[PDB]
Amino acid sequence: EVEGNSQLQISFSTALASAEFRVQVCSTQVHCAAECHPPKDHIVNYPAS
């Protein structure tokens, strides 16, 4: 929802820990970056992002 001058907390994952990932809000683009910390346990059940 874009209702006004507000924020959406987009929850998406990546693979590389330092990641400049691009997301577009429907006519806007953006390339925002983050520093990811690696996971704890080795064994998971499902695949990855």
Partner 1 sequence: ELGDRKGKVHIPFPLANVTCRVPKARNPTVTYGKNQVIMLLYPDHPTL
Q: Are 3 and 18 in contact (CB under 8 A)?
A: no
Contacts with partner 1: how many residues (CB under 8 A)? 4
Residues 1-40 that bind partner 1 (CB under 8 A): none
Near partner 1 by CB under 8 A: residue from 28, 41, 46, 48: 41
Q: At 35, phi and psi to the nearest 5? A: -110, 110
List CB contacts of 1: < 8 A, sequence separation 6 or more: 8
Near partner 1 by CB under 8 A: residue from 3, 10, 30, 42: 42
Positions touching partner 1 (CB under 8 A) are 41-44
